[PDB]
Structure formats: C-alpha cells, structure tokens
C-alpha cells in the first residue's frame, strides 16, 4: 500500500454529484487520460482483449467520469505504434466495445485527442512516410532528439498554414467519429509538451507568422481546434487540457515568468466563448506557482490532476473551490476500485511503474480490489 | 468609531519588520496614496501650512511606509488645480519640508507620480493651453465627460509617439527631483483608470500602432515608464500600482475575462527584469471591491476574481490595499503570504495613529467623506489620536 494515512472522502465535496456536459456524475473522482501502450500494432487498434476489462474495472463505481488514454486523431498525429487511433473503421469498431463496457457500468467516457508533434519518434514516422512535425524547423526538444531525427532522414518540420488546417480537420473528424461511436465527449490534449503545447510555449515557438510571436498568436492553433471541435460536437461535449507549470517535453514551466499570462489568455478566451453561449464542459489542469489563477477567469467546471492520492487533505481543500473535480492518475492505474477506496478511506495499492507502458496484461488488469489485496 | 469589534494585529506578520527598497520598515501597515486636494492653486503647490502636519501625524509610528497623494510630474499630466505637482522649484521647496517631517519621525516616503489622461477636467487644461490627453481621440470615458470636453473646445487627443516620449521624460524628471528633495522612492500610478491604465485596458485603447492591439502593445507605455524611471533612480527606488479589477474611470474590470492576462503579462515582464538584476521595490495592487449584492446570480460570478495570481509570477514584495480596516482576520491571512504589506486608505485618513490602533486592537475613528477633497484643514489634520475611553 501507498505510504500515507488514508482518510475517508465520502463526506467531502469530492463525493457530491455534479453535471459535466451531458453527464450526471455521481461523484468527482476522475480517471484522467493515461497512456498505457496496450493498443495493437499495426493499425493503432484498441486492444479490446485486455482494454475492455481495464476500463470496465475502473468505471465500476456508477457515475464515474473516465477520460481515455491519449488517442491519435490521424496517422500523422501519431508515431507510437501501440497507442490507439480513432480515425479508422477498425479502430472505431473496437472503441465502441470499450464505450459499451463503461456505459454498462453507468459511467461516462470522454476520448482524449492526442497529437504528438516533436515528441514523436521520427524513424517510426519515416517508415510510415510521415513528417516529424512541430511549430518550427529548428527548435528541437534536445540534442539527442535532433540527432535521432537526422539519423532517420526525418528532420523536424515547422508546419505550414495548410498543414495546420489539415490537423484541425483531423481533430473534427476524430471528434465526430468518437461521438458517433457512443463517447460522451472529447478532450483536446493541449498539455504536456505535445503539438498544441509546442505552439503555446515560446520555448518551442518563435514562428513569425500569425501562429507565433505573441501570446495571442501562440494560442491561435489551440483556439482554432477548440472552435472547430465545438462547432462539430457542441461545447457540452468538448473539454481541453493544459499544464501551465509542466516542463516535460522541454516546455518552459515557471522558469519563464510570462507563462501564467499565456494560460490566462487562452482560458480568458475560453471564458469569452462561454459568455457568448459556448461553454466547454470542463477545463483540465495538470497540477505543478499554482493553478489558483483559473478561478479568477474561468467560471465553469475545473478538473485538477496531480499528486492528490497521497494528500487527501489537499484534495479536500481544493474540492471546496467551485465546480472542482479531482483527478487521480497513477493511483487509478493501480486501484481498480479507487473510488470506493477514496470514499471509505481505505489503503491504496502501490503502483508498479515498470508496467505503466508495457504490452502486458500484467500491471494493467491484475491490480487487486481492496478485498483481493487483503 | 467604526462599528466593528477591533482585533489586535501586533502578534501577526503585519508587525514583523521588512526591508522595502532601501528602507527598513518596522511593520507592514502602509499608508497608500490618498488624494485630498489641499494643494495651493495656482502652481499646484503642496500646502505645507497644512500638509506637513498631515504627513507628520500619519508617520508618527516609527518605520512606517508613507506613499504620498498622487502628484503630477508635469503640468500637462494634471488638470485638478488643488493637487500637487513635483516639477517646479516652488513645489519642491514644500515637498522637502514634508519629507523632512516624515523622516524626523523615523518613517519613509514614496511619491506617487500621477498622470491623469481622460480623467482630467478638460476646461481646466484648456485655460492653461494644455491638451486633454488619452490613448485615442474618440474613446471617451462617458457622454457627460465628452460634452464637458467639447463645451471646453478641448476634445480628447490620442497622444503621439513623441508625446508619449515627453510624458516618459516628465516621469524621469519628476522622479529625479523627488529623490533629490529627499524622497525614499517613487511609485508609478498605473491604476484606477488614469493615463497608463487607459493604455492597458482595451476598453480605452484600440490604437493600431505598437501601443495598441495586443496585450504586449497595451503594456508598452507602462513598461517604457518603468524602464526609464528605473534607469534614472534605480529599481530599489521605484514601485508601481495596478488595479486589475477596478472599474473606476470606465475601466473593464472582471467583466472582461481577458483582463487577468493583461496584468499577468505586465507583472511577468517585471519579474523578468527582476531576474536580470533590476527588481522593483514593490508592486501595489488594489483589491476587488465588495460586490453589488443586487447583481443577478450569474453576473456575480462573472465579475469575481482575486489578486492571488501575483504570487505565481512576482517574487518580490506586494502591497495589497482595500477593505482591510474592518477585516483584521483577512489582513492577518493575506499577511502570511510572502513579503506582503497591507495598506489602509480611508482609515488612515481618519486615524493618524492608525498603526498603534491596529497593533493593539483599539477602536477606529469613523471617516468623514464630506471632507475627503475639501480645501480645508478640517477633515485633514483634526482627526484625533486615540484617547482612552473612561
Ligand atoms: C503512465 C502514464 C500515462 C499518462 N498518459 C497521459 C495521456 O495519455 N494524456 C495526458 O494528458 N496525460 C497523461 N498522463 C498524466 C496524468 O493524467 C496525470 O496528469 C499525472 O499522472 C499526474 O496525476 P497523478 O499524480 O495522480 O499521477 C499520464 C501519466 C502517467 C503516469
Ligand atoms: C479620498 C481618496 C483619495 C484617494 N486617492 C488616491 C490617489 O491619489 N492615488 C491612488 O493610487 N489611490 C488613491 N485612492 C485609493 C486608495 O489608495 C485605496 O486603494 C482605496 O481607498 C481602498 O483602500 P481602503 O478600503 O482601505 O480605503 C484614494 C481613495 C480615497 C477614498
């Protein structure tokens, strides 16, 4: 079991119901998007053989919001062979099964749409005849990644206006397919140093067209994606994720003092859209400065994710803020019955980091329920 | 006495000493800038006859930070005839006396440099052959104000690049003169809807040159003033005041959800300058006002925000001002945040010994709004110090 003194959350805000988009959540413990690398290659196909049971376990407490693992909305968005896609018929046939399992449990599923940019593996992309994309040609994540891209004869490529538009069409296509197959909503991944974050952050975007050179310009791609997705599926079925203080992927974080203003701009623009009648279902923030700033800008639901499993005091406190959901990542990997365990203040299984990203049933669906653990 | 149950603050962080700029404060109760209009017209001359005593009284607790009333750095900056300036020999002679009285009391004095813009009285300016200035020709603060300007034949004038540079020169001139006359520092007024704020806020600035059209351009003037003043007198003798949620002067406040970004940007630019070796002594923020209880449910939450975001950006001292007199628990709470100073406005008008009273949890005199801006010693130097109840 994890090393903390467990405390029951059942009489806190974390266990009050809330409406998020179209869904009546019975509580506010959320499963955030978690990359697990169990999808089948080739074809980036969801591995229903193992994945259906994974999402069934974790949606077992009725009225849970589940956000899927990052899912590629197109081939060119991708680059990791064992991450699922949602653009092909054969992918969607498998997703439908997963969604059905979550719905049988009377829980909800939101698909996270994930586009890699410079975090992709350039030799895998090259094999598939695909570009190694980012905001720029020359701002590589690091010298090792640069040497990787050069060795693959797939140098980083700052995307054109036309290729930007093609991405936006791919977000749209993937969002409509997800909803058509039964998903309750989609989440636009704009965090953790992937493609849209690469535009947002000045460390990875010094473009001199309208997509770089200012806070407004750096937010433009993200906001065009939001607007296109909102138009296709409705704001009630759309969410977005940010990581203001993240440095993963060679992003700025707090080391750049202008980082908060970048996020306050983009969230303000989402707020302006909401006042005009198109309010996103929720904004998801990665916890580290602090994320307190959001509450002065966005007047909609907020999901906060990061470090809450070992800190029920801080989860309790943050949930007193208005319309705040509390996400659990690593602890949800390791605890199928996390919601129950949180509600009752039971000990939590320790996670096994060695099986986070392996192509195995082990460390995926064999973590025990509280009863089994005893 | 104010109708509240006072609580003592002397064992809180409010009464822990702190170094601001060159000055060792004994405590964190600050007198913020307070316009009182006792200056002599013509000449915008500090009224030493009364003003020396006013500032002597309120500086009596040793080691208090006093920020002066807003003070014009040149004539063209002004437009209120009973507000002081600090450009002329006559003005400076009286300021010297005022600063010496604060220093005799072992306290410190920072001159707020105040530039009016469209808040000015256009007929007052016209009589002196001065412009009625703002970011734009056409975005007036309201219809009444537009008529006032037109009847005075002094229409609003969006200032040129050369004129922006001449204002910056006047801030510099005034800062150097202020420091020469013995001021401990200066505070750039960039709040409450005055000239600099009119540039910061999109509601009053849609210029299509490098001073409008984006967060960065809207900030340009304020940051030009900061940089010029810092280079002239040093960062340790320079401060700045913002009012992110203010609507005074027909500013946006929280009703515009893009307002926080504007301020996070400017403050981040200051943090950048700090990290490179030039840290402003402090940033002064006006707190959000108490909300209108009659706002409908939705518009209540729309307007709502706090200044807590500053602590995620700026790593230096913060002065927070607004609504603390009647809420010692909140002052106590806000003072436990890093390097935080607490300002008292209306209550320092009314309580010359306000520091002592907050230290020991004594009743506070009521303020009389009728004499906030009257050219009188009455309601200026006649509020009494605490006199024991029998
Ligand atoms: C194995 C693993 C996979 C992850 N995959 C994703 C992903 O697909 N998309 C995403 O936005 N964040 C992802 N994250 C970040 C988590 O959602 C969450 O923000 C992070 O784990 C912090 O939460 P925790 O402290 O409760 O683990 C992942 C984290 C881990 C540990
Ligand atoms: C009569 C009066 C004069 C003021 N003059 C100034 C001024 O010259 N400069 C300034 O930045 N703020 C000025 N303010 C605003 C105060 O500094 C302070 O932000 C405000 O009074 C709220 O604080 P309080 O609730 O303790 O009064 C003034 C306020 C009042 C009531």
PDB file of C-alpha atoms and ligand atoms in Angstrom, chain A residues 32-35 70 112 189 192 241 286 305-307 328-330 333 356-357, ligand 1:
ATOM      1  CA  UNK A  32      -7.622  11.306 -16.313  1.00  0.00           C
ATOM      2  CA  UNK A  33      -6.093  10.259 -19.610  1.00  0.00           C
ATOM      3  CA  UNK A  34      -3.338   7.714 -19.027  1.00  0.00           C
ATOM      4  CA  UNK A  35      -1.122   6.362 -21.822  1.00  0.00           C
ATOM      5  CA  UNK A  70      -4.414   9.796 -25.379  1.00  0.00           C
ATOM      6  CA  UNK A 112      -8.688  12.425 -25.291  1.00  0.00           C
ATOM      7  CA  UNK A 189      -4.864  17.421 -25.347  1.00  0.00           C
ATOM      8  CA  UNK A 192       2.493  18.001 -21.524  1.00  0.00           C
ATOM      9  CA  UNK A 241      -6.291  20.044 -21.010  1.00  0.00           C
ATOM     10  CA  UNK A 286      -2.155  19.463 -14.522  1.00  0.00           C
ATOM     11  CA  UNK A 305      -4.959  16.329 -11.663  1.00  0.00           C
ATOM     12  CA  UNK A 306      -1.673  15.630  -9.922  1.00  0.00           C
ATOM     13  CA  UNK A 307      -0.438  14.324  -6.552  1.00  0.00           C
ATOM     14  CA  UNK A 328      -6.162  10.587  -9.908  1.00  0.00           C
ATOM     15  CA  UNK A 329      -3.559   9.181 -12.336  1.00  0.00           C
ATOM     16  CA  UNK A 330      -1.051   6.704 -11.075  1.00  0.00           C
ATOM     17  CA  UNK A 333      -3.709   2.686 -12.728  1.00  0.00           C
ATOM     18  CA  UNK A 356       2.961   1.529 -16.913  1.00  0.00           C
ATOM     19  CA  UNK A 357       3.920   1.272 -20.656  1.00  0.00           C
TER      20      UNK A 357
HETATM   21  C1  LIG C   1       1.636   6.066 -17.346  1.00  0.00           C
HETATM   22  C2  LIG C   1       1.100   7.456 -17.515  1.00  0.00           C
HETATM   23  C3  LIG C   1       0.430   7.807 -18.692  1.00  0.00           C
HETATM   24  C4  LIG C   1      -0.046   9.106 -18.910  1.00  0.00           C
HETATM   25  N1  LIG C   1      -0.677   9.364 -20.078  1.00  0.00           N
HETATM   26  C5  LIG C   1      -1.289  10.584 -20.300  1.00  0.00           C
HETATM   27  C6  LIG C   1      -2.118  10.848 -21.541  1.00  0.00           C
HETATM   28  O1  LIG C   1      -2.350   9.841 -22.376  1.00  0.00           O
HETATM   29  N2  LIG C   1      -2.629  12.119 -21.649  1.00  0.00           N
HETATM   30  C7  LIG C   1      -2.483  13.039 -20.678  1.00  0.00           C
HETATM   31  O2  LIG C   1      -2.968  14.201 -20.755  1.00  0.00           O
HETATM   32  N3  LIG C   1      -1.773  12.852 -19.508  1.00  0.00           N
HETATM   33  C8  LIG C   1      -1.240  11.657 -19.225  1.00  0.00           C
HETATM   34  N4  LIG C   1      -0.580  11.407 -18.012  1.00  0.00           N
HETATM   35  C9  LIG C   1      -0.529  12.452 -16.976  1.00  0.00           C
HETATM   36  C10 LIG C   1      -1.693  12.053 -15.957  1.00  0.00           C
HETATM   37  O3  LIG C   1      -3.014  12.158 -16.443  1.00  0.00           O
HETATM   38  C11 LIG C   1      -1.733  12.970 -14.738  1.00  0.00           C
HETATM   39  O4  LIG C   1      -1.823  14.365 -15.216  1.00  0.00           O
HETATM   40  C12 LIG C   1      -0.458  12.659 -13.897  1.00  0.00           C
HETATM   41  O5  LIG C   1      -0.307  11.250 -13.725  1.00  0.00           O
HETATM   42  C13 LIG C   1      -0.482  13.289 -12.505  1.00  0.00           C
HETATM   43  O6  LIG C   1      -1.537  12.668 -11.765  1.00  0.00           O
HETATM   44  P1  LIG C   1      -1.176  11.686 -10.508  1.00  0.00           P
HETATM   45  O7  LIG C   1      -0.199  12.482  -9.624  1.00  0.00           O
HETATM   46  O8  LIG C   1      -2.453  11.393  -9.722  1.00  0.00           O
HETATM   47  O9  LIG C   1      -0.488  10.522 -11.246  1.00  0.00           O
HETATM   48  C14 LIG C   1      -0.035  10.120 -17.809  1.00  0.00           C
HETATM   49  C15 LIG C   1       0.654   9.790 -16.620  1.00  0.00           C
HETATM   50  C16 LIG C   1       1.223   8.530 -16.447  1.00  0.00           C
HETATM   51  C17 LIG C   1       1.902   8.297 -15.126  1.00  0.00           C
END
